[PDB]
Enzyme design. Structure first.
Site, PDB file in Angstrom:
ATOM      1  N   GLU A  28       0.587  -1.325  -0.062  1.00  0.00           N
ATOM      2  CA  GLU A  28       0.007  -0.031   0.176  1.00  0.00           C
ATOM      3  C   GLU A  28       0.741   1.341   0.020  1.00  0.00           C
ATOM      4  O   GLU A  28       0.498   2.245  -0.911  1.00  0.00           O
ATOM      5  CB  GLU A  28      -1.045  -0.145   1.254  1.00  0.00           C
ATOM      6  CG  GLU A  28      -2.374  -0.799   1.235  1.00  0.00           C
ATOM      7  CD  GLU A  28      -3.142  -0.827  -0.071  1.00  0.00           C
ATOM      8  OE1 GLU A  28      -3.056   0.378  -0.378  1.00  0.00           O
ATOM      9  OE2 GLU A  28      -3.870  -1.444  -0.250  1.00  0.00           O
ATOM     10  N   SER A  80     -11.444  11.721  -3.692  1.00  0.00           N
ATOM     11  CA  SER A  80     -10.817  11.438  -2.563  1.00  0.00           C
ATOM     12  C   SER A  80      -9.320  11.146  -2.756  1.00  0.00           C
ATOM     13  O   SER A  80      -8.829  11.020  -3.744  1.00  0.00           O
ATOM     14  CB  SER A  80     -11.769  10.161  -2.055  1.00  0.00           C
ATOM     15  OG  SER A  80     -11.408   8.950  -2.972  1.00  0.00           O
ATOM     16  N   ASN A 108      -8.846   6.126   3.220  1.00  0.00           N
ATOM     17  CA  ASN A 108      -9.475   6.589   2.098  1.00  0.00           C
ATOM     18  C   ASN A 108     -10.465   8.056   2.851  1.00  0.00           C
ATOM     19  O   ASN A 108     -11.360   7.602   3.741  1.00  0.00           O
ATOM     20  CB  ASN A 108     -10.337   5.816   1.492  1.00  0.00           C
ATOM     21  CG  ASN A 108     -11.134   6.498  -0.180  1.00  0.00           C
ATOM     22  OD1 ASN A 108     -11.268   7.659   0.023  1.00  0.00           O
ATOM     23  ND2 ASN A 108     -11.283   5.591  -0.930  1.00  0.00           N
ATOM     24  N   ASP A 114     -15.656  -3.879   9.566  1.00  0.00           N
ATOM     25  CA  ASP A 114     -16.973  -3.387   9.090  1.00  0.00           C
ATOM     26  C   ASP A 114     -17.847  -4.383   8.147  1.00  0.00           C
ATOM     27  O   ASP A 114     -18.998  -3.967   7.278  1.00  0.00           O
ATOM     28  CB  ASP A 114     -16.898  -2.037   8.210  1.00  0.00           C
ATOM     29  CG  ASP A 114     -16.156  -2.140   6.875  1.00  0.00           C
ATOM     30  OD1 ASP A 114     -16.164  -3.516   6.368  1.00  0.00           O
ATOM     31  OD2 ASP A 114     -15.864  -1.269   6.089  1.00  0.00           O
TER      32      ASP A 114
HETATM   33  C1  LIG Z   1     -19.376   0.514   8.802  1.00  0.00           C
HETATM   34  C2  LIG Z   1     -19.208   0.828   7.326  1.00  0.00           C
HETATM   35  O1  LIG Z   1     -20.099   0.167   6.639  1.00  0.00           O
HETATM   36  C3  LIG Z   1     -19.149   2.162   6.983  1.00  0.00           C
HETATM   37  N1  LIG Z   1     -19.325   2.312   5.248  1.00  0.00           N
HETATM   38  C4  LIG Z   1     -19.684   3.649   4.986  1.00  0.00           C
HETATM   39  C5  LIG Z   1     -20.905   4.254   5.535  1.00  0.00           C
HETATM   40  N2  LIG Z   1     -22.018   4.605   4.537  1.00  0.00           N
HETATM   41  C6  LIG Z   1     -23.207   4.426   5.232  1.00  0.00           C
HETATM   42  C7  LIG Z   1     -23.533   3.117   5.855  1.00  0.00           C
HETATM   43  O2  LIG Z   1     -22.958   2.197   5.943  1.00  0.00           O
HETATM   44  O3  LIG Z   1     -24.550   3.216   6.988  1.00  0.00           O
HETATM   45  C8  LIG Z   1     -21.658   4.481   3.138  1.00  0.00           C
HETATM   46  C9  LIG Z   1     -22.592   3.186   2.566  1.00  0.00           C
HETATM   47  N3  LIG Z   1     -21.756   2.197   1.808  1.00  0.00           N
HETATM   48  C10 LIG Z   1     -22.772   1.015   1.540  1.00  0.00           C
HETATM   49  C11 LIG Z   1     -23.734   0.579   2.404  1.00  0.00           C
HETATM   50  O4  LIG Z   1     -23.182   0.508   3.758  1.00  0.00           O
HETATM   51  O5  LIG Z   1     -24.733   0.221   2.133  1.00  0.00           O
HETATM   52  C12 LIG Z   1     -20.516   2.000   2.308  1.00  0.00           C
HETATM   53  C13 LIG Z   1     -19.848   0.601   1.821  1.00  0.00           C
HETATM   54  N4  LIG Z   1     -18.667   0.350   2.680  1.00  0.00           N
HETATM   55  C14 LIG Z   1     -18.866  -0.903   3.703  1.00  0.00           C
HETATM   56  C15 LIG Z   1     -19.800  -1.719   3.676  1.00  0.00           C
HETATM   57  O6  LIG Z   1     -20.758  -1.449   4.212  1.00  0.00           O
HETATM   58  O7  LIG Z   1     -19.705  -2.828   2.944  1.00  0.00           O
HETATM   59  C16 LIG Z   1     -18.087   1.739   3.228  1.00  0.00           C
HETATM   60  C17 LIG Z   1     -17.703   2.029   4.715  1.00  0.00           C
END
Ligand SMILES: C[C@@H](O)CN1CCN(CC(=O)O)CCN(CC(=O)O)CCN(CC(=O)O)CC1
Ligand SMILES: C[C@@H](O)CN1CCN(CC(=O)O)CCN(CC(=O)O)CCN(CC(=O)O)CC1
Ligand SMILES: [Cl-]
Ligand SMILES: [Cl-]
Ligand SMILES: [Cl-]
Ligand SMILES: [Cl-]
Ligand SMILES: [Gd]
Length: 129
Positions: A35, A50, A59, A101
């Site tokens: 990375e 980003s 990120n 996550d």
């Molecule tokens: C905790 C992580 O989930 C944070 N997450 C960012 C948070 N937001 C909104 C939310 O997730 O509530 C963006 C939503 N988006 C798709 C979705 O979640 O439906 C992101 C997907 N990834 C991870 C994943 O979900 O697989 C990125 C990290």
């Protein structure tokens, strides 16, 4: 700061990454090499505006605030500049949230393509841990 291999392994172990969510220490050292080349000051711009920051290229879309990624989140509650420090505490703590996550270490593209399914223990071989 540009870390040595065993130096980084020791720091990562001290902050509790060894076997975190089932990922042995060699996985984390392998990811950091590909990375960032072990360089805490690494940055790379993505096509969507980003930017990825630090030793594990976290990120700015979701994880930190850099003041120029409009409509982004800051889920680690830190300025992205904190991820470039010689002290890896902030990077490690944010990575713990990411790997928890749902997608595990597949969040790091270089890990999936260059570390997954290999002898990852080789990355800590020779180190006094
Ligand atoms: C905790 C992580 O989930 C944070 N997450 C960012 C948070 N937001 C909104 C939310 O997730 O509530 C963006 C939503 N988006 C798709 C979705 O979640 O439906 C992101 C997907 N990834 C991870 C994943 O979900 O697989 C990125 C990290
Ligand atoms: C909006 C979509 O995210 C809908 N989402 C259903 C709603 N819940 C919780 C929630 O999203 O508030 C699901 C919990 N969970 C992930 C999580 O922790 O959000 C499952 C994964 N996916 C998507 C993803 O999150 O990547 C399921 C689709
Ligand atoms: Cl290992
Ligand atoms: Cl921003
Ligand atoms: Cl440190
Ligand atoms: Cl997993
Ligand atoms: Gd998400």
């Amino acid at each position: 700061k540009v870390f040595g291999r065993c130096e980084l392994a020791a720091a990562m172990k001290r902050h509790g990454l060894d076997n975190y969510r089932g990922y042995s220490l060699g996985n984390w050292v392998c990811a950091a090499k590909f990375e960032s080349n072990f360089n805490t000051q690494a940055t790379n711009r993505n096509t969507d505006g980003s930017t990825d920051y630090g030793i594990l290229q976290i990120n700015s879309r979701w994880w930190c605030n850099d003041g120029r990624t409009p409509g982004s989140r800051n889920l680690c509650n830190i300025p992205c500049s904190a991820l470039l420090s010689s002290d890896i505490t902030a990077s490690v703590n944010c990575a713990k949230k990411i790997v928890s996550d749902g997608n595990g270490m597949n969040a790091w593209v270089a890990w999936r393509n260059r570390c997954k399914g290999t002898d990852v223990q080789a990355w800590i071989r020779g180190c006094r841990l």
